[PDB]
Amino acid sequence: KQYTTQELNAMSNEDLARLGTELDDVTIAYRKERFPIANDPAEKRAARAVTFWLVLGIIGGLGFLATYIFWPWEYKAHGDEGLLAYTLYTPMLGITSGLCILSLGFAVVLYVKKFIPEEIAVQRRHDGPSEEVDRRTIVALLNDSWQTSTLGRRKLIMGLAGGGAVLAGLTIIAPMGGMIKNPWNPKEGPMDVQGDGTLWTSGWTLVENDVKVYLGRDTAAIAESHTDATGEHWSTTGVSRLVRMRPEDLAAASMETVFPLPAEMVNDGAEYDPAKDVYEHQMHSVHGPRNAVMLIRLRTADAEKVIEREGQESFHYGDYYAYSKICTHIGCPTSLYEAQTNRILCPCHQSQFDALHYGKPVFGPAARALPQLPITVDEEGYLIAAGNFIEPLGPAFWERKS
Amino acid sequence: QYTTQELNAMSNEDLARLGTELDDVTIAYRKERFPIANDPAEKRAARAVTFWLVLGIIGGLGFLATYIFWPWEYKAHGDEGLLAYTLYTPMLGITSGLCILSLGFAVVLYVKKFIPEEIAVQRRHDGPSEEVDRRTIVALLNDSWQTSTLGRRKLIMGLAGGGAVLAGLTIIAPMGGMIKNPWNPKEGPMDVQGDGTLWTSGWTLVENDVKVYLGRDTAAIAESHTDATGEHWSTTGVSRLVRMRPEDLAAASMETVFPLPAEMVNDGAEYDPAKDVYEHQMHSVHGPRNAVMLIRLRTADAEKVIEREGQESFHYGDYYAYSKICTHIGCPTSLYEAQTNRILCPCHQSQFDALHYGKPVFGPAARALPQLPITVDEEGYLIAAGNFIEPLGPAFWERKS
Amino acid sequence: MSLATVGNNLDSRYTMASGIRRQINKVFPTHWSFMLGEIALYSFIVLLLTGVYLTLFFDPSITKVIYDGGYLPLNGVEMSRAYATALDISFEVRGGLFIRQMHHWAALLFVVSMLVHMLRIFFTGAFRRPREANWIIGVVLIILGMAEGFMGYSLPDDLLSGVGLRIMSAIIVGLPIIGTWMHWLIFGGDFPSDLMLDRFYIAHVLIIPAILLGLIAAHLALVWYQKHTQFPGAGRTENNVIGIRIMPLFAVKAVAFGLIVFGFLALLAGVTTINAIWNLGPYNPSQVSAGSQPDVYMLWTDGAARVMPAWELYLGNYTIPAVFWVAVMLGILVVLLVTYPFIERKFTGDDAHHNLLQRPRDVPVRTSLGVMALVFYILLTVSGGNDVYAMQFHVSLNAMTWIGRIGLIVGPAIAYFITYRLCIGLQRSDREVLEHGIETGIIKQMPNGAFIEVHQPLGPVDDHGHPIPLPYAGAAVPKQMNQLGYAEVETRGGFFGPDPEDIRAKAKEIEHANHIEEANTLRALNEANIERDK
Amino acid sequence: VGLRIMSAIIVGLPIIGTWMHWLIFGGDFPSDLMLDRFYIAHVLIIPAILLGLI
Numbered sequence A: 001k002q003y004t005t006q007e008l009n010a011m012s013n014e015d016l017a018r019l020g021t022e023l024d025d026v027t028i029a030y031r032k033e034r035f036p037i038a039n040d041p042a043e044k045r046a047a048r049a050v051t052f053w054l055v056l057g058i059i060g061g062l063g064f065l066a067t068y069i070f071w072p073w074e075y076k077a078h079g080d081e082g083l084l085a086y087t088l089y090t091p092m093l094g095i096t097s098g099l100c101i102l103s104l105g106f107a108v109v110l111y112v113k114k115f116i117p118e119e120i121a122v123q124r125r126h127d128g129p130s131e132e133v134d135r136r137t138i139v140a141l142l143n144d145s146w147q148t149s150t151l152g153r154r155k156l157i158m159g160l161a162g163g164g165a166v167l168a169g170l171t172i173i174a175p176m177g178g179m180i181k182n183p184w185n186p187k188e189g190p191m192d193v194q195g196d197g198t199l200w201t202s203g204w205t206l207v208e209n210d211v212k213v214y215l216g217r218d219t220a221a222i223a224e225s226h227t228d229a230t231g232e233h234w235s236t237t238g239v240s241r242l243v244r245m246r247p248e249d250l251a252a253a254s255m256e257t258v259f260p261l262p263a264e265m266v267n268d269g270a271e272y273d274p275a276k277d278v279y280e281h282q283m284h285s286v287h288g289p290r291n292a293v294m295l296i297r298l299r300t301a302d303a304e305k306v307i308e309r310e311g312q313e314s315f316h317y318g319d320y321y322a323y324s325k326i327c328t329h330i331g332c333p334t335s336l337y338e339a340q341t342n343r344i345l346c347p348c349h350q351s352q353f354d355a356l357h358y359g360k361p362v363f364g365p366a367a368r369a370l371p372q373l374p375i376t377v378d379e380e381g382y383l384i385a386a387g388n389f390i391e392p393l394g395p396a397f398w399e400r401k402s
Numbered sequence B: 001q002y003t004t005q006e007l008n009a010m011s012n013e014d015l016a017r018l019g020t021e022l023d024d025v026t027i028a029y030r031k032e033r034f035p036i037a038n039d040p041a042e043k044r045a046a047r048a049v050t051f052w053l054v055l056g057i058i059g060g061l062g063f064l065a066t067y068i069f070w071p072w073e074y075k076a077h078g079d080e081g082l083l084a085y086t087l088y089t090p091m092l093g094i095t096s097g098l099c100i101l102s103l104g105f106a107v108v109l110y111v112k113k114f115i116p117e118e119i120a121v122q123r124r125h126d127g128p129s130e131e132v133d134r135r136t137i138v139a140l141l142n143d144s145w146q147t148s149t150l151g152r153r154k155l156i157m158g159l160a161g162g163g164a165v166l167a168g169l170t171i172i173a174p175m176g177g178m179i180k181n182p183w184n185p186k187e188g189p190m191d192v193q194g195d196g197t198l199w200t201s202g203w204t205l206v207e208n209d210v211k212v213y214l215g216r217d218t219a220a221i222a223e224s225h226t227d228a229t230g231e232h233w234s235t236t237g238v239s240r241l242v243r244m245r246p247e248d249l250a251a252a253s254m255e256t257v258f259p260l261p262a263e264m265v266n267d268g269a270e271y272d273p274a275k276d277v278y279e280h281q282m283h284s285v286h287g288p289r290n291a292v293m294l295i296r297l298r299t300a301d302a303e304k305v306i307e308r309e310g311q312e313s314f315h316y317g318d319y320y321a322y323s324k325i326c327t328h329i330g331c332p333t334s335l336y337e338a339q340t341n342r343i344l345c346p347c348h349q350s351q352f353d354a355l356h357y358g359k360p361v362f363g364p365a366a367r368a369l370p371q372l373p374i375t376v377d378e379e380g381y382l383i384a385a386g387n388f389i390e391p392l393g394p395a396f397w398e399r400k401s
Numbered sequence C: 001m002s003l004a005t006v007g008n009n010l011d012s013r014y015t016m017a018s019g020i021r022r023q024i025n026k027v028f029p030t031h032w033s034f035m036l037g038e039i040a041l042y043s044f045i046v047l048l049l050t051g052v053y054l055t056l057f058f059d060p061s062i063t064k065v066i067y068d069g070g071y072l073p074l075n076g077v078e079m080s081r082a083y084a085t086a087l088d089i090s091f092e093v094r095g096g097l098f099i100r101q102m103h104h105w106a107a108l109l110f111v112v113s114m115l116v117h118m119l120r121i122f123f124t125g126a127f128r129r130p131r132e133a134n135w136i137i138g139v140v141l142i143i144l145g146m147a148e149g150f151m152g153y154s155l156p157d158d159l160l161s162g163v164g165l166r167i168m169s170a171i172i173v174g175l176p177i178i179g180t181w182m183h184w185l186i187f188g189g190d191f192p193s194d195l196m197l198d199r200f201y202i203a204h205v206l207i208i209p210a211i212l213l214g215l216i217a218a219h220l221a222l223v224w225y226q227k228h229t230q231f232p233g234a235g236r237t238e239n240n241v242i243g244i245r246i247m248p249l250f251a252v253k254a255v256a257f258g259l260i261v262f263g264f265l266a267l268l269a270g271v272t273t274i275n276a277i278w279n280l281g282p283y284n285p286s287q288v289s290a291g292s293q294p295d296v297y298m299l300w301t302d303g304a305a306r307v308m309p310a311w312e313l314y315l316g317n318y319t320i321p322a323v324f325w326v327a328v329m330l331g332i333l334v335v336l337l338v339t340y341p342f343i344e345r346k347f348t349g350d351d352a353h354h355n356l357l358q359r360p361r362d363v364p365v366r367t368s369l370g371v372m373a374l375v376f377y378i379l380l381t382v383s384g385g386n387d388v389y390a391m392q393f394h395v396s397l398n399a400m401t402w403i404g405r406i407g408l409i410v411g412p413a414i415a416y417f418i419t420y421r422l423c424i425g426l427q428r429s430d431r432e433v434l435e436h437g438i439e440t441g442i443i444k445q446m447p448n449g450a451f452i453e454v455h456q457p458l459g460p461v462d463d464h465g466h467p468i469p470l471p472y473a474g475a476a477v478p479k480q481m482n483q484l485g486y487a488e489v490e491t492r493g494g495f496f497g498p499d500p501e502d503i504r505a506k507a508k509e510i511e512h513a514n515h516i517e518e519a520n521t522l523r524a525l526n527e528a529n530i531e532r533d534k
Numbered sequence D: 001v002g003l004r005i006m007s008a009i010i011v012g013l014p015i016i017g018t019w020m021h022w023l024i025f026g027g028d029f030p031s032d033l034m035l036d037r038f039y040i041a042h043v044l045i046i047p048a049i050l051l052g053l054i
């Protein structure tokens, strides 16, 4: 029922509150004050508990701002002065900020838990089906709209409208074919030291273009900071990332990561030029997706009991063998050459390849043997790639034979 | 209230009217479009809607056909099929319109010709709430606040405010990591763009006892070399900047020059095709306050020049050099009028007199263009005898004058 | 302050008094585990804000540069702009490392809070009718949060993260019949590519956050509309809700718990390193590390790849790689998680409108399925980091792979058995108390020498003194006497001295009256509910 | 050219023009972070304020 202004005026404020909650089908079953005694010692005892954490909220906030402005934050390397002060900047930031924010939160939780009254409140639900008049009437209105329209009679306009609707949808989404790309269309231009950009090739395919491709080791060189009257300049003009390597280099039971190093990008030996900028291209070679090759030297006792694969006989040169460093499972580096067991282990999902059984997987989720590179030595005695792999490198895909 | 037995004895018209009334709406007037049994006007309207739908089909199928099978790759001026390339995107939008606009017109015509004409009236429930709601909500909020008792305890409330504002400052203090002093050097050794502050440019290197030629821009692009192991773009023997000599410019001409330190030259008798000076020279070209305009005047105009105080010996014969950056808000003043000797800014049409030490004569600029002191060296190339005597570019609060 | 004018203007312009009265009067049930969704909300807000901060300093490009930044042990090293600007965030921005680590800790908290929240929802039965929609969108939310963290930590372009991207790429090419084309679409080419980091960046900062926020919004709106579930208890029916109102209690509690969450993440962000990209170096396809592993919320996928045997089909000109079945496994367990309410309704035949919850002891099939799935996921997660486990607990690696394999059958089954029997046992303990009364712990000796334990009944008694057994009611039954309040202190004062005896007597009288009337109102509401059921 | 002009407006403001500029651009113009801040403003922040206000 409604209330006139005089009746609402006649009420007390608590009575208006009771009416307010009951208008939403809420009822306060129970509600009682925390400190009814007039000058309770427990109320002052609770106030001091709350002010403790508010004091520390203020202390922590001010300490955070002090730490954040005036604490020496800038980087120090090992052996520098004020190293310890730098290593603690972020720690102090967090302990002060945590002090501040946690103390504010605890103050508020305590205030609720011992000052605001306690209550049981009970609200009635209104859910499930609706009240049937509304169901019947909404169905009536929607059915009325559909039959009003007269579109159900016109099968031709409906069919054509749906056809135009779906075709307009196609017209909207068709430019998503700007993302579609044939995986078998090669990359632009000629072949690169990373291949033609298909899943077949690599840099080692360049042998088929009559290029001499050395096996090259990574020197891990960095740019050098020259400095002069016009500034400070990091440069790479006389620096080789990849350098040729020779068969004497690896002891037995050694492993070296080698990359394709065409003879045009070499800059080492007596033919070294101190202004021949090749670092960019050798870097492009080191970052080829499936360019890394694992070059192992077996012991003679091991090479006496190495098992060869059909067609991959004479790929090795003496005791030197060469496998693809890309795992045949889902493409991690197969870096872990257990030198004694002669097993190459992938640290991703723990596949194990037998270096004495043409790299056949003997454990893990891999199923195919590691591809093998044919290698030899040239007229100057540098190791070179005598051919290309006879397999697709890397993991498997739907279009791959065996 | 509507019991089910009453609600059952109701038509769909009755229930629809009840529904609109339950929502404070009343359809005051609604009349069918084609009441007659065999109206030819209905068939006429149906043909109208069918037309645009069929044309929407044609437009959409044309779109997909074009987007797939029309040749779309770039063709240059000399190529065969430049027409077929230039009409691709045109055709795409022609057919996209013909699909979507045709579907739109179809829906408009259907709602105009076939759906009945309706007038409906709905009552508003706006303005103040009823008084009981206002009184009850005020009672509930007063109850919450007074029963909370937080107004009785001023110390706790004050410290809560203090802790909350200090927590807020704790939250937003990381934005102070976005702050940078605008007057720190950049902070390595000074380079061909200055020390990164507003007081310096490449020409400041002159004050470090570096020879800085005036370098003219060649616009030379990288070269593509290809061979049996790939294709690559190279700039090894290429130079973006070259030294120049006073015999190059005619008697009313303007060149844009940049600061070319002696360590970046690589042209003339000392040219090596393996010296790769490109990226540093580009760094010189891409400094904000680096561009200067070197003007050779006619003789009879040069002897009308009014110099600025302290800058009477900055020129070299008929050669004058002015900062190319405008003193308004930083555009290049690249429009030298050869006959009027006005230097004009294209951004907001400031005009500077070149026979009056670069003093503005129009537009919103107020300060004169800075002048660079220049001369020739022993080998016969033009060099910067010194740095500018003033800050350059637009003005800031800290700039004197 | 003249709030009257503000309220009057707002009300005269919007007619808002009733609508706002409805929201300050809304009731929420106040069990503790109804805060586990809140954590996910708050950590999400932290993720948003800290994320925007990081975007002001980050360049997502795969273009290479020579490094010349703060961190000297990598100066002169060729690296992408992504790795370079992550290092600049870490070392050249003041407090940047703090905000980075706070962002990552917030990500971890977001995902695990979603997990434990979903487990509350599962074990209590809050998914069933009318609330299945929140279940479907919540499963979507946990999946998208996982994807979001993956794409997020793939951005800084360090070695470990790039190995993760390599593994993603390898799994997408392996798909029949369309994996190669899908890969060339997603990555724009072969891996790595130009647009991969740009696409992961805009997926991470814009697309997935937008879907996540929109679904969190729909989720919270449905939770607010369909009022919250509750456990059984005195006065509680299918047709009501008992708890506290929005204004003042619950809103303040929400703000305070949010402050606690924010401060805990701030603290973590300072006192513990996470990720540490500067030790890992930049990404290189030819390098790897032993402690690989994705982030914790992805280790299950990793473990699925480790426990799978090398089962491949050669057809013969086409190939089905061995990881395809791992994708099938993930698809199965996603579908089974998202469609579980319908599975339970098929095999139980229950389809009523449920607003009360179930204690997990009382629904033992679901609790046992839950714990067995927990054990399957635990063994996948430990299978992921199984080599770290092997290194750090002197277990053979291969032993751990076979432990993972066999465990993914025998662990779930043993878990089902043990869980089911423990559930029935807890039921029986509750029925013991409702049959014979609380075991007080007191043992008396009678005159005949019989040791009898003293029981406290929770109901009437027969004239023999034996309780009349009460029916179970789906609520918690007190097991010890101190739950009834017989241990409660009756002195009052500070730690160092008592109050005056006047105040203590008065206060204890008042407290006794409080307890009596709270019990009375719940008893009256209980009787009223019986009467409403006629 | 338009970014140049906006930068020149911002430096001219007193007192805080130079400091405002070094905040927005993260340095002297053109800056390493300029386009990236404009990017995330354009794709995330302003579209979100716009969608919320719409």
Ligand code: HEM
Pocket (backbone or CB within 6 Å): C047, C048, C050, C051, C052, C054, C055, C058, C086, C089, C100, C101, C103, C104, C107, C110, C145, C146, C148, C149, C152, C153, C154, C155, C156, C204, C205, C206, C209, C274, C275
């Ligand atoms: C609009 C919202 C977000 C933005 C703008 C954002 C932004 C970023 C950016 C730019 C990075 C780059 C790397 C770095 O600077 O350290 C990053 C890292 C990350 N993000 Fe986000 N992010 C958002 C939301 C999220 C969400 C919702 C999650 C988790 C569900 C998440 C998880 C991560 C993780 C795990 C990292 C790696 C942290 C690290 O590099 O140490 N982000 N975020």
Ligand code: HEM
Pocket (backbone or CB within 6 Å): C033, C034, C035, C036, C037, C038, C040, C041, C044, C114, C117, C118, C121, C126, C127, C131, C134, C135, C136, C137, C138, C139, C141, C142, C216, C219, C223, C227, C228, C229, C230
């Ligand atoms: C970021 C993700 C999520 C957020 C922010 C969130 C937030 C919330 C909040 C605040 C509540 C009410 C308070 C509570 O019950 O704890 C809630 C309830 C609920 N949540 Fe979520 N939740 C998320 C994910 C999920 C997931 C993963 C599921 C299940 C698959 C789920 C299903 C539910 C259901 C069914 C309820 C209703 C509980 C009831 O009515 O008794 N939500 N959620």
Ligand SMILES: C/C=C(C)/C=C/C=C/[C@H](OC)[C@@H](C)[C@@H](OC)[C@@H](C)CCc1oc2c(O)c(OC)cc(OC)c2c(=O)c1C
Pocket (backbone or CB within 6 Å): B346, B347, B348, D001, D002, D003, D005, D006, D009, D024
């Ligand atoms: C992150 C950004 C922030 C905080 C911005 C704050 C606002 C600053 C200014 O108000 C103080 C603002 C109103 C406005 O300045 C009038 C600027 C936008 C500058 C607009 C602007 O652009 C031009 C432009 O783009 C051009 O391109 C070719 C060319 C132009 O002339 C030829 C102009 C131009 O003459 C102006 C004024």
Ligand SMILES: C/C=C(C)/C=C\C=C\[C@H](OC)[C@@H](C)[C@@H](OC)[C@@H](C)CCc1oc2c(O)c(OC)cc(OC)c2c(=O)c1C
Pocket (backbone or CB within 6 Å): A347, A348, A349, C143, C144, C146, C147, C150, C151, C160, C161, C163, C164, C165, C167, C168, C171, C292, C293, C294, C295, C298, C301, C302, C303, C305
């Ligand atoms: C709906 C989702 C969208 C829009 C976007 C993104 C989707 C993300 C996917 O999940 C949903 C994605 C995480 C997933 O896709 C199968 C793959 C990466 C596979 C998971 C995966 O990762 C690893 C990883 O990261 C590692 O890092 C160092 C290391 C790893 O082993 C050591 C693994 C690994 O063994 C597996 C199986």
